[PDB]
Amino acid sequence: SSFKCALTKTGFQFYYLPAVYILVFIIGFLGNSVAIWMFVFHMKPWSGISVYMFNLALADFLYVLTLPALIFYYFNKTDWIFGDAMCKLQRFIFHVNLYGSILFLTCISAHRYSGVVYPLKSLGRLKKKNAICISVLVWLIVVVAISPILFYSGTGVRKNKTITCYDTTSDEYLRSYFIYSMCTTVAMFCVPLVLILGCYGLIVRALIYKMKKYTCTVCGYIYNPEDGDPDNGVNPGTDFKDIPDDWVCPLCGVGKDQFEEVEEPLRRKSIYLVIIVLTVFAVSYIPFHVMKTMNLRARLDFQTPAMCAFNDRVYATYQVTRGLASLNSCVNPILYFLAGDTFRRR
Ligand SMILES: CNc1nc(I)nc2c1ncn2[C@H]1C[C@H](OP(=O)(O)O)[C@]2(COP(=O)(O)O)C[C@H]12
Ligand SMILES: [Zn+2]
């Protein structure tokens, strides 16, 4: 007989995961409701960034709205009572949010990269129209790519007579599902992650190289390392700290001590982007994608009595990493502030 391992459902699933979802739900609702208000009604002129970020706030918000049912499902010992159609919807909206977020973060990273590494030369490519078209596509690519989940997922009856809402699919269709899940993880997670780390290295590199500008607090004259002050014997490409003390402002004659660092908004936002997005990937996206795959494998290839112990640890970890996937929806809001365009700047 086709031996099936015995599985173990912990208190994390029935009691403690739904509690976390309640917190995500509340904070997520607040964070993104406010964010959406700030974009739609206070940011225009939107740069391409605000276009992308608005799309994130939009997808996180709609996702959060699916939490109550998920919360109810775990409180109800994972017995799903809203039927097949709503199960498929729950899972569909989860993965659309998941992969939409990933791609939008890629666009945001790409956007910021071009603006940082090619400041004078990308202007046309970074305009808002392009951002809107890219955003439409991103939704098209995701909906198309994730649509099979409407087939694969859905409702099923357990031996104990309670109803399961598959997040993946039932045994009869697992093989093809595995192949499908491999494609999306490769195309809509692995590739992006590579593109993102690409951008990020280049961005950091350009930021560490770019010499700081300084400004005369007495007459406003900006010193640009790129131009230097050739007419007074400072060559193009000299750093302000390398200028001998005896130099003075060439416009009014005050000393170096009267100068101050020019605050470069784009450098700060780029670093806040890197830090936040790498954190999010390490806590929410990577562990989930590792564990989704291992857990499918376990279900297919590692189904023997020797493995079962290891297997329900995998299943157990999978549950936590699936819960950790939801944290982007109440962390992304800090992105919109710290890494997005500044309110007015005028
Ligand atoms: C180590 N992974 C699994 N091993 C065994 I045996 N059964 C598993 C494993 N992972 C999931 N299952 C069962 C059990 C699981 O149902 P349940 O809601 O956990 O009772 C299920 C798929 O759930 P999901 O991954 O689509 O969210 C029908 C499968
Ligand atoms: Zn001056």
Side-chain angles (χ1 to χ4, degrees), residues 1-343:
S1 58
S2 166
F3 176 77
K4 321 196 167 208
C5 276
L7 220 54
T8 315
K9 295 167 79 77
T10 85
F12 174 81
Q13 289 184 111
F14 299 151
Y15 313 102
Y16 314 116
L17 178 56
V20 170
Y21 282 148
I22 290 163
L23 289 167
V24 168
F25 168 75
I26 287 164
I27 298 148
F29 193 82
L30 297 178
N32 297 287
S33 287
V34 170
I36 287 164
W37 266 302
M38 295 303 98
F39 285 112
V40 172
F41 298 107
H42 306 286
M43 272 285 162
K44 292 166 192 170
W46 285 9
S47 80
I49 297 281
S50 286
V51 174
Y52 299 137
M53 274 167 182
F54 171 69
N55 276 296
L56 265 174
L58 201 64
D60 281 324
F61 176 76
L62 300 169
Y63 168 59
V64 167
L65 263 43
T66 64
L67 290 172
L70 197 70
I71 291 162
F72 181 73
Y73 169 79
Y74 286 102
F75 274 134
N76 200 214
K77 316 300 185 181
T78 69
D79 181 40
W80 184 268
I81 73 178
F82 309 104
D84 197 24
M86 300 297 91
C87 174
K88 294 166 184 291
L89 192 58
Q90 195 69 202
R91 306 316 194 182
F92 182 73
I93 287 168
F94 177 76
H95 285 99
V96 172
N97 171 256
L98 175 55
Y99 291 107
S101 296
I102 287 163
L103 294 182
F104 280 116
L105 292 172
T106 309
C107 305
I108 289 157
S109 307
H111 199 89
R112 214 54 114 181
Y113 155 82
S114 303
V116 166
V117 185
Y118 301 102
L120 311 99
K121 295 154 302 309
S122 24
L123 273 47
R125 171 164 60 208
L126 298 191
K127 68 194 161 198
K128 169 169 177 170
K129 274 185 185 194
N130 294 342
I132 274 150
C133 288
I134 279 161
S135 298
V136 169
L137 292 168
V138 161
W139 293 119
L140 306 207
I141 294 162
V142 176
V143 165
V144 165
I146 300 311
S147 74
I149 277 162
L150 294 175
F151 175 83
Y152 277 110
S153 305
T155 256
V157 173
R158 303 186 176 89
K159 309 212 166 167
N160 87 352
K161 259 60 180 196
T162 57
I163 303 172
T164 176
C165 178
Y166 297 96
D167 185 38
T168 60
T169 203
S170 64
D171 303 68
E172 211 183 328
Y173 310 90
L174 252 193
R175 284 279 160 188
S176 64
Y177 183 93
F178 185 81
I179 293 153
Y180 166 66
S181 168
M182 288 307 313
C183 300
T184 59
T185 291
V186 165
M188 305 210 282
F189 166 74
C190 302
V191 161
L193 173 48
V194 164
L195 292 181
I196 277 167
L197 298 160
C199 298
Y200 283 9
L202 297 162
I203 285 160
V204 171
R205 172 167 89 186
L207 284 181
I208 294 171
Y209 282 106
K210 174 145 170 161
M211 294 170 286
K212 293 189 189 146
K213 308 194 186 72
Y214 285 81
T215 178
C216 190
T217 57
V218 187
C219 75
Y221 161 83
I222 284 96
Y223 170 87
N224 173 359
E226 237 83 310
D227 305 338
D229 187 21
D231 286 341
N232 302 302
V234 177
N235 295 320
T238 308
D239 219 340
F240 190 71
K241 59 147 159 35
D242 296 341
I243 290 165
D245 304 305
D246 324 322
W247 191 81
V248 289
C249 182
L251 237 71
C252 67
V254 294
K256 275 189 83 184
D257 62 341
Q258 293 294 299
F259 272 50
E260 230 95 290
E261 195 172 301
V262 182
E263 212 359 278
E264 39 214 354
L266 200 73
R267 163 189 319 260
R268 197 201 303 145
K269 293 173 188 165
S270 301
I271 297 158
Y272 275 130
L273 178 64
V274 168
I275 288 163
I276 290 157
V277 172
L278 291 185
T279 307
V280 167
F281 266 73
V283 168
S284 291
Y285 298 126
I286 296 162
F288 176 59
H289 278 93
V290 174
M291 293 303 152
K292 179 189 204 336
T293 318
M294 281 204 57
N295 185 74
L296 278 171
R297 289 300 304 285
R299 279 172 75 182
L300 283 161
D301 306 333
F302 297 119
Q303 207 75 162
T304 179
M307 291 290 288
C308 305
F310 173 66
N311 288 2
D312 66 338
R313 290 196 257 129
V314 173
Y315 174 80
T317 318
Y318 176 55
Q319 298 297 316
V320 178
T321 52
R322 186 154 65 178
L324 287 183
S326 295
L327 299 197
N328 60 273
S329 288
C330 45
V331 174
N332 286 338
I334 294 101
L335 211 42
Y336 315 148
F337 271 128
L338 289 179
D341 293 335
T342 10
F343 166 69

Coordinates of all heavy atoms in Angstrom, one line a residue, residues 46-56 103-104 107-108 111 123-139 341:
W46 N 3.6 62.7 -9.2 CA 4.2 61.4 -8.9 C 5.4 61.1 -9.8 O 5.2 61.3 -11.0 CB 3.2 60.2 -9.2 CG 2.0 60.1 -8.1 CD1 1.7 60.9 -7.1 CD2 1.1 59.0 -8.1 NE1 0.7 60.5 -6.4 CE2 0.2 59.3 -7.0 CE3 0.8 57.9 -8.9 CZ2 -0.9 58.5 -6.7 CZ3 -0.3 57.1 -8.5 CH2 -1.1 57.4 -7.4
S47 N 6.5 60.8 -9.3 CA 7.6 60.2 -10.1 C 7.3 58.8 -10.3 O 6.4 58.2 -9.7 CB 8.9 60.4 -9.4 OG 9.1 59.4 -8.4
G48 N 8.1 58.1 -11.1 CA 7.9 56.7 -11.4 C 7.9 55.9 -10.1 O 7.3 54.8 -10.0
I49 N 8.7 56.3 -9.1 CA 8.8 55.6 -7.8 C 7.4 55.6 -7.2 O 6.9 54.5 -6.7 CB 9.8 56.3 -6.9 CG1 11.2 56.2 -7.5 CG2 9.8 55.6 -5.5 CD1 11.9 54.9 -7.4
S50 N 6.8 56.8 -7.1 CA 5.5 56.9 -6.4 C 4.4 56.0 -7.2 O 3.5 55.5 -6.5 CB 5.0 58.3 -6.3 OG 5.7 59.0 -5.3
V51 N 4.6 55.9 -8.5 CA 3.7 55.0 -9.2 C 3.9 53.6 -8.7 O 3.0 52.9 -8.3 CB 4.0 55.1 -10.7 CG1 3.2 54.0 -11.5 CG2 3.7 56.5 -11.3
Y52 N 5.1 53.1 -8.8 CA 5.4 51.7 -8.3 C 5.0 51.6 -6.9 O 4.2 50.7 -6.6 CB 6.9 51.4 -8.4 CG 7.5 51.5 -9.8 CD1 8.7 52.1 -10.1 CD2 6.8 50.9 -10.9 CE1 9.2 52.1 -11.4 CE2 7.2 51.0 -12.2 CZ 8.4 51.6 -12.5 OH 8.9 51.6 -13.8
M53 N 5.4 52.4 -6.0 CA 5.0 52.3 -4.5 C 3.5 52.4 -4.3 O 3.1 51.7 -3.4 CB 5.7 53.4 -3.7 CG 7.1 52.9 -3.3 SD 8.1 54.3 -2.6 CE 9.6 53.3 -2.3
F54 N 2.8 53.2 -5.0 CA 1.4 53.2 -4.9 C 0.8 51.8 -5.2 O -0.1 51.3 -4.5 CB 0.7 54.2 -5.9 CG -0.7 54.1 -5.9 CD1 -1.5 54.5 -4.8 CD2 -1.4 53.6 -7.0 CE1 -2.9 54.4 -4.8 CE2 -2.8 53.6 -7.1 CZ -3.5 54.0 -6.0
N55 N 1.4 51.2 -6.3 CA 0.9 49.9 -6.6 C 1.2 48.9 -5.5 O 0.3 48.0 -5.3 CB 1.6 49.4 -7.9 CG 0.8 49.9 -9.1 OD1 -0.3 49.5 -9.4 ND2 1.5 50.7 -9.9
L56 N 2.3 49.0 -4.8 CA 2.6 48.1 -3.6 C 1.5 48.3 -2.5 O 0.9 47.4 -2.1 CB 3.9 48.4 -3.1 CG 5.1 47.5 -3.6 CD1 6.4 48.0 -3.0 CD2 4.9 46.1 -3.1
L103 N 8.0 41.9 -7.9 CA 8.3 42.6 -9.2 C 8.3 44.1 -9.0 O 9.2 44.8 -9.5 CB 7.3 42.2 -10.3 CG 7.4 40.7 -10.8 CD1 6.4 40.5 -11.9 CD2 8.7 40.3 -11.2
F104 N 7.4 44.6 -8.2 CA 7.4 46.1 -8.0 C 8.6 46.6 -7.3 O 9.2 47.7 -7.6 CB 6.1 46.6 -7.3 CG 5.0 46.7 -8.2 CD1 3.9 46.0 -8.1 CD2 5.1 47.6 -9.3 CE1 2.8 46.1 -9.0 CE2 4.0 47.8 -10.1 CZ 2.9 47.0 -10.0
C107 N 11.2 46.8 -10.0 CA 11.1 48.1 -10.7 C 11.7 49.3 -9.8 O 12.4 50.1 -10.3 CB 9.7 48.4 -11.1 SG 8.9 47.1 -12.0
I108 N 11.3 49.3 -8.6 CA 11.8 50.4 -7.7 C 13.3 50.3 -7.6 O 13.9 51.4 -7.7 CB 11.2 50.2 -6.3 CG1 9.7 50.6 -6.3 CG2 11.9 51.2 -5.3 CD1 9.0 50.0 -5.1
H111 N 14.6 51.4 -11.0 CA 14.4 52.9 -11.1 C 15.5 53.6 -10.4 O 16.2 54.4 -11.0 CB 13.0 53.3 -10.5 CG 12.6 54.6 -11.0 ND1 11.8 54.8 -12.1 CD2 12.8 55.9 -10.5 CE1 11.5 56.0 -12.3 NE2 12.1 56.7 -11.3
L123 N 16.9 60.2 -17.6 CA 15.7 61.0 -17.4 C 14.5 60.6 -18.2 O 13.4 60.3 -17.6 CB 16.0 62.5 -17.8 CG 16.6 63.4 -16.7 CD1 17.7 62.8 -15.9 CD2 17.1 64.7 -17.2
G124 N 14.6 60.4 -19.5 CA 13.6 59.9 -20.4 C 13.0 58.6 -20.0 O 11.8 58.4 -19.9
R125 N 13.9 57.6 -19.6 CA 13.5 56.3 -19.2 C 12.7 56.3 -17.9 O 11.9 55.4 -17.6 CB 14.7 55.3 -19.2 CG 14.4 54.0 -18.5 CD 15.4 52.9 -18.8 NE 16.7 53.3 -18.3 CZ 17.9 52.9 -18.8 NH1 17.9 52.1 -19.9 NH2 19.0 53.3 -18.3
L126 N 13.0 57.3 -17.0 CA 12.4 57.3 -15.7 C 11.2 58.1 -15.6 O 10.7 58.4 -14.5 CB 13.4 57.9 -14.7 CG 14.7 57.1 -14.5 CD1 15.5 57.6 -13.3 CD2 14.4 55.6 -14.4
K127 N 10.6 58.6 -16.7 CA 9.4 59.4 -16.6 C 8.2 58.6 -16.2 O 8.1 57.4 -16.4 CB 9.2 60.2 -17.9 CG 8.8 59.4 -19.1 CD 9.0 60.3 -20.4 CE 9.1 59.5 -21.7 NZ 9.8 60.3 -22.7
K128 N 7.2 59.3 -15.7 CA 6.0 58.7 -15.1 C 5.2 57.9 -16.1 O 4.6 56.8 -15.7 CB 5.1 59.8 -14.5 CG 3.7 59.4 -14.1 CD 2.9 60.4 -13.3 CE 1.5 59.9 -13.1 NZ 0.6 60.6 -12.1
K129 N 5.1 58.2 -17.4 CA 4.4 57.5 -18.4 C 4.9 56.0 -18.4 O 4.1 55.1 -18.3 CB 4.4 58.1 -19.8 CG 3.3 59.2 -20.0 CD 3.4 59.6 -21.5 CE 2.4 60.8 -21.8 NZ 2.2 61.0 -23.2
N130 N 6.2 55.9 -18.6 CA 6.9 54.6 -18.6 C 6.6 53.8 -17.3 O 6.4 52.6 -17.4 CB 8.4 54.8 -18.7 CG 8.8 55.4 -20.1 OD1 8.0 55.3 -21.0 ND2 10.0 55.9 -20.2
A131 N 6.5 54.5 -16.2 CA 6.2 53.8 -14.9 C 4.8 53.2 -14.8 O 4.6 52.2 -14.2 CB 6.5 54.8 -13.7
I132 N 3.9 53.9 -15.5 CA 2.5 53.5 -15.5 C 2.3 52.3 -16.4 O 1.6 51.3 -16.0 CB 1.6 54.6 -16.0 CG1 1.2 55.5 -14.8 CG2 0.3 54.1 -16.6 CD1 1.0 57.0 -15.2
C133 N 2.9 52.3 -17.6 CA 2.9 51.2 -18.5 C 3.6 50.0 -17.9 O 3.1 48.9 -18.0 CB 3.5 51.7 -19.9 SG 2.4 52.8 -20.8
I134 N 4.7 50.2 -17.2 CA 5.4 49.1 -16.6 C 4.6 48.5 -15.5 O 4.5 47.2 -15.4 CB 6.8 49.5 -16.1 CG1 7.8 49.6 -17.2 CG2 7.3 48.6 -15.0 CD1 9.0 50.4 -16.9
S135 N 3.9 49.3 -14.8 CA 3.0 48.9 -13.7 C 1.8 48.1 -14.2 O 1.4 47.1 -13.6 CB 2.5 50.1 -12.9 OG 3.6 50.7 -12.3
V136 N 1.2 48.5 -15.3 CA 0.1 47.8 -15.9 C 0.6 46.4 -16.3 O 0.1 45.3 -15.9 CB -0.5 48.5 -17.2 CG1 -1.4 47.6 -17.9 CG2 -1.2 49.7 -16.7
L137 N 1.7 46.3 -17.1 CA 2.3 45.0 -17.4 C 2.6 44.1 -16.2 O 2.3 42.9 -16.3 CB 3.7 45.2 -18.2 CG 3.6 45.8 -19.6 CD1 4.9 46.3 -20.1 CD2 2.9 44.9 -20.5
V138 N 3.2 44.7 -15.2 CA 3.5 43.9 -14.0 C 2.3 43.2 -13.5 O 2.3 42.0 -13.3 CB 4.1 44.8 -12.9 CG1 4.1 44.1 -11.5 CG2 5.6 45.2 -13.2
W139 N 1.2 43.9 -13.3 CA -0.1 43.2 -13.0 C -0.5 42.2 -14.1 O -1.1 41.2 -13.8 CB -1.2 44.3 -12.9 CG -1.0 45.1 -11.7 CD1 -0.8 46.4 -11.6 CD2 -0.9 44.6 -10.3 NE1 -0.6 46.8 -10.3 CE2 -0.7 45.7 -9.5 CE3 -0.9 43.3 -9.8 CZ2 -0.5 45.6 -8.1 CZ3 -0.8 43.2 -8.4 CH2 -0.6 44.3 -7.6
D341 N 9.8 59.1 -2.7 CA 10.0 60.5 -2.9 C 9.6 61.3 -1.7 O 8.7 60.9 -0.9 CB 9.2 61.0 -4.1 CG 9.7 60.4 -5.4 OD1 10.9 60.1 -5.5 OD2 8.9 60.3 -6.3

